[PDB]
Amino acid sequence: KLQDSLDAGVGNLVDADLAKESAKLQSLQTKQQLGVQALSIANSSSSAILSLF
Amino acid sequence: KLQDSLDAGVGNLVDADLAKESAKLQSLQTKQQLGVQALSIANSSSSAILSLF
């Protein structure tokens, strides 16, 4: 019984809550795609100077 | 485990950060179009002498 309670306590300390991690995974992937699009916009923004001459 | 760690370290030493490279590609290409236009404006400048005489 003592070894069982000790394993359960170590698990309470280290083990992760996978549901919260799945939520942050989805939000972060969507944020990454938005960041790639924002980077493409930032590259495209320079082009307007080209036509001025 | 040691093989994987050594490979990851060499990869840190040599791998490129591609997103900054795409941004450099865009800014550089725009710089070439503007520079070609500047070279054309430069070639234009000598024309006025034919009118002056």
Short mmCIF file of N, CA and C in Angstrom, two decimals, chain A residues 29-45:
data_model
loop_
_atom_site.label_atom_id
_atom_site.label_comp_id
_atom_site.label_asym_id
_atom_site.label_seq_id
_atom_site.Cartn_x
_atom_site.Cartn_y
_atom_site.Cartn_z
N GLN A 29 -1.14 25.98 -33.33
CA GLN A 29 -1.00 25.71 -34.75
C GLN A 29 -1.72 26.77 -35.57
N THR A 30 -2.92 27.15 -35.14
CA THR A 30 -3.63 28.19 -35.87
C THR A 30 -2.89 29.52 -35.79
N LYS A 31 -2.28 29.81 -34.64
CA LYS A 31 -1.49 31.03 -34.54
C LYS A 31 -0.28 30.98 -35.45
N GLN A 32 0.30 29.80 -35.64
CA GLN A 32 1.46 29.70 -36.51
C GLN A 32 1.09 29.96 -37.96
N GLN A 33 -0.04 29.41 -38.40
CA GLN A 33 -0.47 29.69 -39.77
C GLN A 33 -0.77 31.17 -39.95
N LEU A 34 -1.39 31.80 -38.95
CA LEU A 34 -1.61 33.24 -39.03
C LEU A 34 -0.29 34.00 -39.08
N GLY A 35 0.73 33.51 -38.38
CA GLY A 35 2.01 34.18 -38.40
C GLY A 35 2.69 34.08 -39.75
N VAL A 36 2.55 32.93 -40.41
CA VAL A 36 3.12 32.80 -41.75
C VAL A 36 2.43 33.75 -42.72
N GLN A 37 1.10 33.87 -42.61
CA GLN A 37 0.41 34.82 -43.49
C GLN A 37 0.82 36.25 -43.19
N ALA A 38 0.99 36.59 -41.91
CA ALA A 38 1.41 37.94 -41.57
C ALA A 38 2.81 38.22 -42.11
N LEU A 39 3.67 37.21 -42.10
CA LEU A 39 5.00 37.39 -42.66
C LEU A 39 4.94 37.63 -44.16
N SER A 40 4.05 36.92 -44.85
CA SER A 40 3.92 37.15 -46.29
C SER A 40 3.42 38.56 -46.57
N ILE A 41 2.51 39.06 -45.73
CA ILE A 41 2.05 40.43 -45.91
C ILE A 41 3.19 41.41 -45.68
N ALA A 42 4.01 41.16 -44.66
CA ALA A 42 5.11 42.07 -44.37
C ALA A 42 6.12 42.10 -45.50
N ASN A 43 6.35 40.96 -46.15
CA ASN A 43 7.22 40.98 -47.33
C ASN A 43 6.58 41.74 -48.48
N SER A 44 5.27 41.53 -48.69
CA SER A 44 4.61 42.15 -49.84
C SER A 44 4.51 43.66 -49.68
N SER A 45 4.55 44.15 -48.44
CA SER A 45 4.30 45.58 -48.22
C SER A 45 5.35 46.45 -48.89
#
